[PDB]
């Protein structure tokens, strides 16, 4: 019910990532690590880089083991090379356990580390199927569960501030909670609703309906999950398949049409600013994603506000204006429920029961008139048909 040792153990923000403190090696080396539900490698900076203030020094760890194998990891935007090994790993604000885990020691990288992000490595929390270089490299959470009595479950509360944080404020500020092995009831309101994990690779789910201000987007539900839909704390935006993105943007523009925004805003590139305190939240629609439920022919919905999908940013000029970027963008690799949508919800990664739970976050940003919601049930037929093959 209560996991006080782990509450408030995250820092960061949607634009640069949420991270947890970890230690690696003997004696322990402290590093800040991105929480990434959309990948499956534990990978840490292990050599000097301009954007790293510290890195893993394998030669100073008595418990370091060399696996004598390189890994080359190219992403769409960014890449790194590293060397595989194992070492003892702990999470200080975590379960009181130490485990031996695989670590990819990053020795070279391009456009991977983010200037000012305050993290030095990534904790891939998804499944072995998508680990690099192959599925034989046991992910961290798998090791944790196998080596300890920690329950096979974790839960994430990512806390968006609702305003920009300077790098001073972002260091001093609590960014949320990763509860390892449990569900903390203080982090949510109302009921938890669960959707099945379709397959254990990414945290893949099935979206069965989409509404903008209650209006059905009315696409074939396969389009919403083309070629998959995942829950991904290591992606900033809500990302939608091209066709869904075009339909959603058209509907959001129509709902918000009392104000005209430039193409660059809708493309997620350009900020828009309002006089301090005057952001017209009410002109922007709510977005509801309906997810397959655990009961046959049953769905539920999660509803987010513009306070979720408009990401606060600092003005390019010097001002007291309230400024934002549109944090919904197109994808060619399926739907990605990124950090901006996770900030609305307490999300339970129930690996043991192959399901993901959603509840309204106790730290979601809202106004006096509307809140994020998790509601059900709804009768929905032929939901397995919504899955892309
Ligand atoms: C939210 C935060 C600001 C973003 C930066 N994200 C990353 O650097 C994530 C670790 C890197 C990766 C690792 O595999 C693919 C790559 C992109 S998508 C994903 N979930 N993880």
Residues 232-271: b if buried by 16+ CB within 10 A, e if exposed = bbbbbbbbbbeebbebbbebbeebbeeeeeeeebbebeeb
Task: For residue 122, report the distance from its CA to the centre of ligand 1, in Å.
Answer: 8
Radius of gyration over alpha carbons of the chain, in Å?
21
Which residues are near ligand 1 (CB < 6 Å)?
A: 16-17, 34, 36, 38-39, 75, 122, 232, 234-236, 339
Task: For residue 30, report the distance from its CA to the centre of ligand 1, in Å.
Answer: 21
Residues of the chain within CATH 2.40.70.10 domain(s) are: 18-150, 151-389
Ligand 1 pocket mutation, candidates 109, 235, 333, criterion most atoms within 8 A of CB: 235
| CA 308 – CA 219 distance, rounded (Å) | 23
Q: Which of 142, 232, 322, 350 is catalytic?
A: 232
Fold of 151-389: Cathepsin D, subunit A; domain 1 (2.40.70)
232 assigned to active site: yes
Positive or negative: CA dihedral 235, 236, 237, 242: negative
Beta bridge mates, 72: 81
Q: Which of 36, 142, 184, 350 is catalytic?
A: 36
Resolution for the entry shown, Å: 1.7
* Both structure tokens of 213: 């201000």
322 assigned to active site: no
Going from the C-alpha of 299 to that of each of 23, 34, 375, the distances in angstroms are: 41, 32, 9
| CA 334 – CA 225 distance, rounded (Å) | 6
Domain spanning 18-150, CATH architecture? Beta Barrel (2.40)
Experimental determination approach used: X-ray
- Residue pair 335/350 in contact (Cβ under 8 Å)? The answer is no
CA 226 to chain centre: 19
Residues 161-200: b if buried by 16+ CB within 10 A, e if exposed = bbebbeeeebeeeebbbbbbbbbbeebbeeebbbbbbbee
């Amino acid at each position: 019910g209560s996991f006080v040792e782990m509450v408030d153990n995250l820092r960061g923000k949607s634009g640069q990532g949420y991270y947890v403190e970890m230690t690696v090696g003997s004696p322990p080396q402290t590093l800040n690590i991105l929480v990434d539900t959309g990948s499956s490698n534990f990978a840490v900076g292990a050599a000097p880089h301009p954007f790293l203030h510290r890195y893993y020094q394998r030669q100073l760890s008595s418990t370091y083991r060399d696996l004598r194998k390189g890994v080359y990891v190219p992403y769409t935007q960014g890449k790194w090379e590293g060397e595989l090994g194992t070492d003892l790993v702990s999470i200080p604000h975590g379960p009181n356990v130490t485990v031996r885990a695989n670590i990819a020691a990053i020795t070279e990288s391009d456009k991977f580390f983010i200037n000012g992000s305050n993290w030095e490595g990534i904790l891939g929390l998804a499944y072995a199927e998508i680990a690099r270089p192959d599925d034989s490299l046991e992910p961290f959470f798998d090791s944790l569960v196998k080596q300890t009595h920690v329950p096979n479950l974790f839960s994430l509360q990512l806390c968006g501030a609702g305003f920009p944080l300077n790098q001073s404020e972002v260091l001093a500020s609590v960014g949320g909670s990763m509860i390892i092995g449990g569900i903390d009831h203080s982090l949510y309101t109302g009921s938890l609703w669960y959707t099945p994990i379709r397959r254990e690779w990414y945290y893949e789910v099935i979206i069965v309906r989409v509404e903008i201000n209650g209006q059905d987007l009315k696409m074939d539900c396969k389009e919403y999950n083309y070629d998959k839909s995942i829950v991904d704390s290591g992606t900033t935006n809500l990302r939608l398949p091209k066709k869904v993105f075009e339909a959603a943007v058209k509907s959001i523009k129509a709902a918000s049409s009392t104000e005209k925004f430039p193409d660059g805003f809708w493309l997620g590139e350009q900020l828009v600013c309002w006089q301090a305190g005057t952001t017209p939240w009410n002109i922007f629609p709510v977005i509801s994603l309906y997810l397959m439920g655990e009961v046959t022919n049953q769905s539920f919905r999660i509803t987010i506000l513009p306070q979720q999908y408009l990401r606060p940013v600092e003005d390019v000029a010097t001002s007291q204006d309230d400024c934002y970027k549109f944090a919904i963008s197109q994808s060619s690799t399926g739907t990605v429920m990124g950090a901006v949508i996770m900030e609305g919800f307490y999300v339970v990664f129930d690996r043991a029961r192959k399901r993901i739970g959603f509840a309204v976050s106790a730290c979601h940003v809202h106004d006096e008139f509307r809140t994020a919601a998790v509601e059900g049930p709804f009768v929905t037929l032929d939901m397995e048909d919504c899955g892309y093959n």
